[PDB]
Amino acid sequence: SPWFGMDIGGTLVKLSYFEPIDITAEEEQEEVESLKSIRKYLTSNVAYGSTGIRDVHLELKDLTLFGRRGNLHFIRFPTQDLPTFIQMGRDTVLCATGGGAYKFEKDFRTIGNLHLHKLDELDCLVKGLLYIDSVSFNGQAECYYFANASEPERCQKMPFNLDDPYPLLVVNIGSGVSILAVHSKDNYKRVTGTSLGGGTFLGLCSLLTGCESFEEALEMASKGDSTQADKLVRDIYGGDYERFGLPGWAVASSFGNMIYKEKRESVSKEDLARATLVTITNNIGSVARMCAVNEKINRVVFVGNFLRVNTLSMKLLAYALDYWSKGQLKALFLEHEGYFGAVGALLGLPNF
Amino acid sequence: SPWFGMDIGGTLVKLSYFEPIDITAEEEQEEVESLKSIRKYLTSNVAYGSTGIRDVHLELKDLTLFGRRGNLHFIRFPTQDLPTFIQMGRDTVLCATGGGAYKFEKDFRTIGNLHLHKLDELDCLVKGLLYIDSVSFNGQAECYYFANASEPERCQKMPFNLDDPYPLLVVNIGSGVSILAVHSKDNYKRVTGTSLGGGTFLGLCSLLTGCESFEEALEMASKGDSTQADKLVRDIYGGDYERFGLPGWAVASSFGNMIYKEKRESVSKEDLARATLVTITNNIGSVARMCAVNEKINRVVFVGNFLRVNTLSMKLLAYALDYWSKGQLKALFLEHEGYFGAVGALLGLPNF
Ligand SMILES: Nc1ncnc2c1ncn2[C@@H]1O[C@H](COP(=O)(O)OP(=O)(O)NP(=O)(O)O)[C@@H](O)[C@H]1O
Ligand SMILES: Nc1ncnc2c1ncn2[C@@H]1O[C@H](COP(=O)(O)OP(=O)(O)NP(=O)(O)O)[C@@H](O)[C@H]1O
Ligand SMILES: CS(=O)(=O)Nc1ccc(CC(=O)N2CCN(c3ccc(C#N)nn3)CC2)cc1
Ligand SMILES: CS(=O)(=O)Nc1ccc(CC(=O)N2CCN(c3ccc(C#N)nn3)CC2)cc1
Ligand SMILES: [Mg+2]
Ligand SMILES: [Mg+2]
């Protein structure tokens, strides 16, 4: 059977697919036409139907996995479209994680003789994260940070070594937010979570602006001015609040200027999109900072698909974590940020 | 001069006024007509102009302050209307705190010979809180909690003794949120803050529902179902997430169901108001819980005017703090929750 790892989240399904590249002439004969059809379908297309996408730039080439060489592919589609995926599959050992491994268990079992093995969402995240970092991103660093995040003329993406990754605070920004403290490969805890996550950004953005997609929400936010909607320290004090080191530019009340009817009538959709992004991102950074201080961990890695093609939020996290921690915490980012659960599920295959 | 304490916040001005009740016959003669006019104006009206309100139920009767007996009155009006207040004053030693003591300093100085003494917002909060608790609420407890907050058939307001109040975590929910750790009467720190506060509730509520007042926002929220807008754990897992003790009813993504166009088209304004209230309140409780664990403090008192006439948020905080802390933290509430800064400012008068 094909080697697949699936993470069915509240919003997106993430799929890792291992394509063998060391197929012998004899093995090619013993391949059934459906298996050959699957491999060619997945490797000859980058869009699958109307909503599936292969993230070609993330492909790991010539990986040795389970004693065979191949390429590891990364594919995503909305959980709303899982019925289409299952229906395509009805006309294999599936290691699956995420909440949908439980919610849609009976649906996967409509595929005759399919064996479904449910694996824990956070166990898979930790295993997949450690694995991808260990094999590298085709010889490049999987982990990076923004150097000199305080100075914009100098702020630049730089590689970060995670050879001894422990301890590590993992902030998983998906529909909601989970925060993990990782002390060893077999010792980790879910410290807490917050419900102000990627789904809050997209849901509030759609309500406030009428945007119809995540990418559209980000494009609006890139054009907006969040201070048209937010009430800042300087709006309350006239300047800094010096006694407690709060700069005038800090947000005192997110959307707090929207209590005034005249300001609601002048704010643009782009301003509201940016205020939503800033509100959600700052809250995540602040919760991450409190968890790091309590866990006595100084390396904070942010994963999940809220940060896909979202440099605004990454730069805001990098700057805010460094600024508000007075340089004691560092924001770390991973190239394969949305796919670690799917990889960890795939890695569970030898157990079964 | 009249004895007044003023806290000029980002949204509301809070005023504490001490009315002497031991005026002798000779003192009444030496009272200038303007002073008599002020005292009679304040004590014979409960509404001042179109936006000032005296909270008569909070009055402290027959208090001994600065060696005189009198009644302590509590008055509020929007900071937007401070120009009207100052203009009324132009046709006294003023101890003032809050950001507006700085922002509007030059405006207060347009009142001839007025001496303005700016006092720190959080120093005044701590001093006023400790003072009011010490003198009691006309012989009743100033501090209360909700007993058996987990069981609704039993949940009831009960008094709480703060005779030895230290240590104490104070969560001040105003326009934004400040969190204080109080170790003694002269030893306290601002632990952190969040910008998701009362102004976020009111601003987002107005954008989403068109409500025109705080009280209207709360009335809408009392009629709504937040789960029409929020994505719950059971929407993602089909039930509880047992491995990490997350019940199916917990919110996984605030407004997370609003990523679906069909759900945006069926949600009511009341549902959105309630989802806004729940989102903001849960975030405040969660940040409070993390700060309490880090500060090693188990008593968490919530103040500020976000909780005025807001039993929904108080009960949600009481339940959530107890539930998510597994009974280790207790949510405490104070009858004079919005006025402690104004009282603390008044208490600074003997310094000058
Ligand atoms: N193409 C997209 N469609 C939808 N959401 C996207 C997309 N791209 C990025 N996002 C963001 O990614 C978030 C989902 O991230 P993801 O890590 O895949 O969550 P999930 O695993 O599906 N949810 P969860 O059950 O909470 O773990 C959304 O809330 C958006 O903020
Ligand atoms: N009549 C009202 N008008 C406006 N807001 C109200 C009213 N009643 C209650 N509120 C709530 O009270 C919050 C303001 O609380 P308050 O403690 O007075 O803040 P503030 O001191 O003015 N702000 P801050 O500068 O951050 O300390 C608002 O954000 C609302 O959520
Ligand atoms: C006194 S007031 O009247 O001006 N009102 C007032 C109320 C609340 C605030 C907010 C606040 O305190 N903060 C501090 C820490 N914050 C962050 C952000 C990102 C990261 C990361 N990574 N960490 N911490 C956010 C904002 C300010 C003023
Ligand atoms: C795994 S998932 O896919 O289901 N996604 C997922 C993501 C985030 C969450 C949220 C979460 O973890 N929590 C825990 C603690 N929370 C509170 C609330 C109030 C108080 C107080 N006082 N304290 N803590 C809020 C919600 C849940 C699921
Ligand atoms: Mg996920
Ligand atoms: Mg205040």
Curated annotation (Swiss-Prot), chains A, B:
CC terms in the record's Gene Ontology section: cytosol; nucleus
Kindly tell me the pathway this chain contributes to: Cofactor biosynthesis; coenzyme A biosynthesis; CoA from (R)-pantothenate: step 1/5
Catalytic activity entry? (R)-pantothenate + ATP = (R)-4'-phosphopantothenate + ADP + H(+)
Record EC number: 2.7.1.33
Question: Quick one: effect of changing R190A?
Answer: Loss of catalytic activity
Function field:
Catalyzes the phosphorylation of pantothenate to generate 4'-phosphopantothenate in the first and rate-determining step of coenzyme A (CoA) synthesis.
Family, according to the entry, reads as follows: Belongs to the type II pantothenate kinase family.
How does this protein assemble? Homodimer.
Q: Where is this chain's protein located in or outside the cell?
A: Cytoplasm
Keywords noted in UniProt: ATP-binding, Coenzyme A biosynthesis, Cytoplasm, Kinase, Nucleotide-binding, Transferase
Residues at the active site: E121 (proton acceptor)
Q: By which gene is this protein encoded?
A: PANK3
**Impact upon substituting E121V:** Prevents acetyl-CoA production
One family name in Pfam for this protein = Fumble
Q: Specify the protein name.
A: Pantothenate kinase 3
GO BP, one example? coenzyme A biosynthetic process
* Molecular function via GO: acetyl-CoA binding; ATP binding; pantothenate kinase activity; protein homodimerization activity; vitamin binding
Q: Which residues form a coiled coil?
A: none
Keyword Transferase recorded:
yes
Name the domain of life this protein comes from.
Eukaryota
What does the annotation give as the result of altering A252F?
Answer: Loss of catalytic activity but can bind ATP normally
**Stated regulation of activity:** Subject to allosteric regulation, exists in two distinct conformational states, a catalytically incompetent (or open) conformation stabilized by the binding of acetyl(acyl)-CoA, and a catalytically competent (or closed) conformation stabilized by ATP-binding. Inhibited by acetyl-CoA and its thioesters which act as allosteric inhibitors and compete with the ATP-binding site. Inhibited by sulfonylureas and thiazolidinediones. Activated by oleoylethanolamide, palmitoyl-carnitine and oleoyl-carnitine.
Enzyme class, top EC level, equals: transferase
Q: What does the entry state regarding organ or tissue expression?
A: Highly expressed in the liver.
Q: Which residues bind acetyl-CoA?
A: S175, S178, R190
